[PDB]
Structure formats: structure tokens, C-alpha cells
Amino acid sequence: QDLSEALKEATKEVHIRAENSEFMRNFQKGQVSREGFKLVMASLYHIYTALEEEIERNKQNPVYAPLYFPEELHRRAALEQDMAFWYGPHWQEAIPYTPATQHYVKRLHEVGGTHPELLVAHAYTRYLGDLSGGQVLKKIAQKAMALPSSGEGLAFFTFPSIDNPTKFKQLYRARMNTLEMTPEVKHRVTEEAKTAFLLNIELFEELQALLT
Numbered sequence: 001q002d003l004s005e006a007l008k009e010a011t012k013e014v015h016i017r018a019e020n021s022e023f024m025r026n027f028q029k030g031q032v033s034r035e036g037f038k039l040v041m042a043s044l045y046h047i048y049t050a051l052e053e054e055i056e057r058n059k060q061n062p063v064y065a066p067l068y069f070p071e072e073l074h075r076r077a078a079l080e081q082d083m084a085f086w087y088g089p090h091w092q093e094a095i096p097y098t099p100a101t102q103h104y105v106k107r108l109h110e111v112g113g114t115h116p117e118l119l120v121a122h123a124y125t126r127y128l129g130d131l132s133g134g135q136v137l138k139k140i141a142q143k144a145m146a147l148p149s150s151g152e153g154l155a156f157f158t159f160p161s162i163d164n165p166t167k168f169k170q171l172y173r174a175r176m177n178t179l180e181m182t183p184e185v186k187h188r189v190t191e192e193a194k195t196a197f198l199l200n201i202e203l204f205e206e207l208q209a210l211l212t
């Protein structure tokens with residue numbers, strides 16, 4: 001079985017649970033507010049910064065190299081633009097760094113520095129989601145908060161270097177399937193993907209508590 005299919009099958013259950021977290025449930029209903037949106041986007045800024053720092057550290061490592069697509073996928077630059085939009089010129093000293101966000105970042109650094117063969121699980125969890133349901137979330141946010149079609153405030157959800165997300169997603173999956181795989185690695189990669197989803201659920205649960 002291809003790694004791309006194994007990951008989808010391994011995370012379809014936790015994905016349903018993630019969609020139904022209180023925060024995401026409210027988001028989908030279009031009940032997302034500026035306060036809550038700023039919290040999630042600031043948290044993602046920290047998460048993608050860590051993820052991409054680890055991707056750079058392992059770009060030449062065969063256990064990840066086939067998935068090195070910084071021009072097309074990396075989100076740090078986009079999040080920096082969004083932070084300036086939502087938090088202003090001095091966003092760097094204004095954005096929050098929640099405990100759940102810190103925990104996620106911690107695991108990313110452990111994986112990138114000690115278990116790089118599992119980094120693909122984290123890239124899969126974040127990037128393939130961004131190219132999929134992330135586009136649905138983008139539309140909901142635009143409608144709920146009156147964000148312009150021009151993209152301001154939603155750079156994170158925009159991929160100017162990718163003509164068609166569906167096509168790129170198929171390419172990314174194909175390259176994922178070229179990674180040298182063994183039962184050992186496949187087993188652990190799918191397990192780490194479930195952990196990545198849980199880290200996201202825990203973040204959402206925390207943000208919801210901060211909002212309520």
C-alpha cells in the first residue's frame with residue numbers, strides 16, 4: 001500500500017474528530033470571530049515556523065527530501081503577512097504563544113532533530129489539509145469576517161505559486177510514495193500522523209477555552 005493511501009486511511013477517523021472540536025464546529029457554522037481567528041492564526045505562525053525550520057534542517061535528508069517544496073508550500077512568509085494585517089506593525093511582540101502551541105512546536109523540534117524520518121507525518125497533516133479543506137475554511141472565514149477577495153488577511157490560505165491545488169496534491173502524494181519505506185517506518189509515520197492530529201485538536205480545545 002502506498003504511503004499516501006496509508007496516511008489518509010490512518011487519519012480519517014481522527015480527522016472527523018478534529019472537524020467536530022468545538023472551535024472548528026463553530027468555525028464551520030461561520031461563527032468565527034476576529035479574536036478567535038487571530039488566536040488560531042498566531043498559533044499557526046509558531047507551528048509553521050517550527051515545521052519549516054525543521055524542513056530546512058532536513059531538506060537534503062533522503063527520508064524527507066522528495067517532499068521539499070518550499071516555493072509552492074511553505075506558509076511562514078504568508079503567516080508573517082497575516083500577522084501584520086491582524087496584529088499590526090509590531091505583531092512580533094503582540095502575538096500569543098499558548099501552551100498547546102508550545103507543546104506542538106516542541107514535538108516538531110523533537111521530530112526534526114531526532115526522528116526526521118517522521119517529519120513527513122507532520123508535513124502531510126498540515127500541508128495536505130491546507131490544500132484541501134483549508135480552501136473550504138478560507139471561504140467560510142471570508143464570508144464570516146468580511147475579508148476581501150483580494151486576499152488580505154488570508155495569505156495563509158493562498159498558494160500563489162500553485163496553479164491548481166488538486167493537481168499539486170496528486171504530485172505531492174506521488175512523491176510521498178517515492179520515499180524509501182519499510183514496515184518500521186510506515187508504521188511509525190502513520191502513528192505520528194495521528195499524534196499530529198491530536199496536537200491540533202488539543203490546540204483547538206485550548207483556544208476554545210481561552211475564548212469562552
Ligand code: HEM
Nearest residue numbers: 007008018019024028124125126128129132133136197200
Ligand atoms: C474545520 C474542520 C475541517 C474541515 C471542514 C476539513 C475538510 C476537509 C476536506 C473537505 C478534505 C478533503 C477530503 C477528500 O478529498 O476526501 C480534507 C482533507 C484533509 N484534511 Fe481537513 N478539514 C478540517 C480540519 C482539519 C484539521 C484540523 C486537520 C489537521 C491539521 C486537517 C487535515 C487534513 C488532511 C491532512 C487532509 C488530506 C487527506 C488526504 O487526502 O490524505 N483537516 N479536509
